[PDB]
Design an enzyme around this catalytic site. Structure first.
Site, PDB file in Angstrom:
ATOM      1  N   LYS A 111      38.670  36.314  46.750  1.00 19.87           N
ATOM      2  CA  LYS A 111      38.933  34.914  46.406  1.00 19.87           C
ATOM      3  C   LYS A 111      40.333  35.080  47.200  1.00 19.87           C
ATOM      4  O   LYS A 111      41.050  34.052  47.829  1.00 19.87           O
ATOM      5  CB  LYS A 111      39.480  34.560  45.137  1.00 19.87           C
ATOM      6  CG  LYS A 111      38.025  34.275  44.229  1.00 19.87           C
ATOM      7  CD  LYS A 111      38.293  34.088  42.981  1.00 19.87           C
ATOM      8  CE  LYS A 111      36.970  33.691  42.040  1.00 19.87           C
ATOM      9  NZ  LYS A 111      35.848  34.432  42.002  1.00 19.87           N
ATOM     10  N   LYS A 141      45.121  40.980  42.635  1.00 22.98           N
ATOM     11  CA  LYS A 141      43.847  40.299  42.174  1.00 22.98           C
ATOM     12  C   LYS A 141      42.835  41.256  41.834  1.00 22.98           C
ATOM     13  O   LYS A 141      42.417  42.279  42.519  1.00 22.98           O
ATOM     14  CB  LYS A 141      43.045  39.514  43.244  1.00 22.98           C
ATOM     15  CG  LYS A 141      41.908  38.631  42.986  1.00 22.98           C
ATOM     16  CD  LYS A 141      42.437  37.523  42.230  1.00 22.98           C
ATOM     17  CE  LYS A 141      41.045  36.816  41.836  1.00 22.98           C
ATOM     18  NZ  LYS A 141      40.320  37.329  40.438  1.00 22.98           N
ATOM     19  N   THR A 142      42.220  41.159  40.662  1.00 29.12           N
ATOM     20  CA  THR A 142      40.878  41.936  40.182  1.00 29.12           C
ATOM     21  C   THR A 142      39.786  41.110  40.611  1.00 29.12           C
ATOM     22  O   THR A 142      39.737  39.948  41.014  1.00 29.12           O
ATOM     23  CB  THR A 142      40.935  41.724  38.830  1.00 29.12           C
ATOM     24  OG1 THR A 142      40.804  40.499  38.472  1.00 29.12           O
ATOM     25  CG2 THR A 142      42.020  42.459  38.212  1.00 29.12           C
ATOM     26  N   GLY A 143      38.765  42.036  40.932  1.00 31.13           N
ATOM     27  CA  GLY A 143      37.277  41.434  41.279  1.00 31.13           C
ATOM     28  C   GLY A 143      36.017  42.266  41.055  1.00 31.13           C
ATOM     29  O   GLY A 143      36.443  43.483  41.264  1.00 31.13           O
ATOM     30  N   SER A 144      35.143  41.672  40.418  1.00 34.86           N
ATOM     31  CA  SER A 144      34.051  42.574  40.306  1.00 34.86           C
ATOM     32  C   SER A 144      32.493  41.891  40.887  1.00 34.86           C
ATOM     33  O   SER A 144      32.572  40.378  41.090  1.00 34.86           O
ATOM     34  CB  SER A 144      33.733  42.714  38.717  1.00 34.86           C
ATOM     35  OG  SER A 144      34.844  43.514  38.365  1.00 34.86           O
ATOM     36  N   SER A 156      35.329  39.209  43.230  1.00 38.77           N
ATOM     37  CA  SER A 156      36.280  38.347  43.299  1.00 38.77           C
ATOM     38  C   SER A 156      37.863  38.582  43.951  1.00 38.77           C
ATOM     39  O   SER A 156      38.592  37.702  44.021  1.00 38.77           O
ATOM     40  CB  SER A 156      36.816  37.797  41.917  1.00 38.77           C
ATOM     41  OG  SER A 156      35.713  37.064  41.348  1.00 38.77           O
ATOM     42  N   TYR A 190      39.380  29.822  35.287  1.00 35.30           N
ATOM     43  CA  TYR A 190      39.042  30.376  36.365  1.00 35.30           C
ATOM     44  C   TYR A 190      37.522  30.310  36.652  1.00 35.30           C
ATOM     45  O   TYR A 190      36.705  30.283  35.868  1.00 35.30           O
ATOM     46  CB  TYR A 190      39.080  31.840  36.006  1.00 35.30           C
ATOM     47  CG  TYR A 190      39.124  33.043  37.057  1.00 35.30           C
ATOM     48  CD1 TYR A 190      39.623  33.362  37.957  1.00 35.30           C
ATOM     49  CD2 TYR A 190      37.781  33.671  36.880  1.00 35.30           C
ATOM     50  CE1 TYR A 190      39.464  34.043  39.120  1.00 35.30           C
ATOM     51  CE2 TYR A 190      37.499  34.531  37.795  1.00 35.30           C
ATOM     52  CZ  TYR A 190      38.152  34.802  39.018  1.00 35.30           C
ATOM     53  OH  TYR A 190      38.033  35.801  39.811  1.00 35.30           O
ATOM     54  N   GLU A 218      47.256  36.016  42.493  1.00 37.25           N
ATOM     55  CA  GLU A 218      48.047  35.716  41.335  1.00 37.25           C
ATOM     56  C   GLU A 218      49.298  36.686  41.238  1.00 37.25           C
ATOM     57  O   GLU A 218      49.522  37.701  41.825  1.00 37.25           O
ATOM     58  CB  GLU A 218      47.122  35.936  40.166  1.00 37.25           C
ATOM     59  CG  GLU A 218      45.903  35.143  40.030  1.00 37.25           C
ATOM     60  CD  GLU A 218      44.926  35.365  39.057  1.00 37.25           C
ATOM     61  OE1 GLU A 218      45.352  35.888  38.052  1.00 37.25           O
ATOM     62  OE2 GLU A 218      43.765  34.982  39.299  1.00 37.25           O
TER      63      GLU A 218
END
Length: 358
Positions: free
Chosen positions: A66, A312-315, A63, A149, A271
């Site tokens: 994004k 931003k986090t994402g996995s 993510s 989300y 964010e």
């Protein structure tokens, strides 16, 4: 200021016990400090083959993709190809259901359509089925009043945002974002010639790569190395050092504040929290809950605030990534890992490293 050896010690002393405790096979870290990227690599990109992580290792960003989608959408706004106020139906006129009246590109981009769910179902594999999915969807709340989300939200935003360009999403991203920023090792589809650089992800100890799915490119599908990701953070932290362009304008639009939930402000993909901010507030402001929450409107959207923690986090199934930066302080960090580990731990690790630069 900290020397390169002092910074290396800070990173190593933090990352080593983290990787052991979480069973993360490999990590690549970039710290942005004094205008320079500083690279640190640890462990294995491919456990079975005993291949080390290097600055050229490709990770699935999940993510974090994004943020690229949000900037590409901002670039399309700056080109005057789309407006966030436009109805969704302007770009997908087949969405004739009454529930779609009143839903805008803004709501797709920022998760405020009223409860679009997290995932496109895996059995939705073509545009006819995708249409039926959105036409069957029943909102829980009026648009522009709640946040949930969702890949079905921002993923659809990205797909519609590129329609005026005449290019498919992947082409538009390469031409308008990757190429102008010289992100020449950042991929939506890893080319055959680059596969030797592609790390495996690890889920329950098994080597995995992200599965294909509708809207994957837009919501979670970018792969990149630590050097390009450091460049991405630098471009978003200091866009004023770029030449004037619609891309520079789009970066500003993506770090504009559209909604507030608690201490978090929702950008386009990015964010933000107002800086200065304590680590517990960042952790508490970065949980994408399973349930809907109410939002506060920022009208008009507020332009980017230099005094921000931007992140931003994402996995994916097998990877966990994190990017964060503070424009006021001109510091930032990229952490790419080939195992998913908890988002609060990513925030705590990043915050502790960045705190040593202050």
């Amino acid at each position: 200021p900290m020397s390169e050896k002092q910074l290396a010690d800070v990173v190593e002393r933090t990352v080593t016990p983290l990787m052991k405790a979480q069973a993360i096979p490999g990590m690549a870290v970039a710290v942005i400090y004094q205008g320079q990227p500083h690279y640190f690599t640890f462990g294995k990109a491919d456990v079975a083959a005993n291949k080390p992580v290097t600055p050229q290792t490709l990770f699935e960003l999940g993510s974090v993709s994004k943020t690229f989608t949000g900037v590409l959408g901002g670039d399309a706004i700056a080109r005057k190809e789309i407006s966030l106020a436009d109805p969704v139906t302007k770009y997908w006129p087949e969405l004739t259901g009454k529930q779609w009246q009143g839903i805008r590109l803004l709501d797709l981009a920022t998760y405020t359509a009223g409860g679009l769910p997290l995932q496109v179902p895996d059995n939705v594999t073509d545009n006819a089925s995708l249409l039926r999915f959105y036409q069957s969807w029943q909102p829980k709340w009026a648009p522009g009043t709640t946040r949930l989300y969702a890949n079905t939200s921002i993923g659809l935003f990205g797909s519609l945002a590129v329609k005026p360009s005449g290019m498919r999403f992947e082409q538009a991203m390469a031409e308008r974002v990757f190429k102008p920023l010289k992100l020449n090792h950042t991929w939506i589809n890893v080319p055959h010639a680059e596969e030797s650089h592609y790390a495996w992800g690890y889920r329950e100890g098994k080597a995995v790569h992200v599965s294909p799915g509708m809207l994957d490119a837009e919501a979670y599908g970018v792969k990149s190395n630590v050097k390009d990701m450091a460049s991405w953070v630098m471009a978003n932290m200091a866009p004023e050092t770029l030449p004037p362009s619609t891309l520079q304008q789009g970066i500003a639009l993506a770090q504009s504040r559209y909604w507030r939930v608690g201490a978090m402000y929702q950008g386009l993909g990015w964010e933000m929290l107002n800086w200065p901010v304590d680590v517990k507030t960042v952790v508490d402001g970065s949980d994408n809950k399973v349930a809907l929450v109410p939002v506060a409107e920022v009208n008009p959207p507020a332009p980017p605030v230099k005094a921000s923690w931007v992140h931003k986090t994402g996995s994916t199934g097998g990877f966990g990534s994190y990017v964060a930066f503070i424009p006021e302080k001109q510091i930032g960090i990229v952490m790419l890992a080939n195992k998913s580990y908890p988002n609060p731990v990513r925030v705590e690790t990043a915050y502790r490293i960045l705190e040593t630069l202050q």
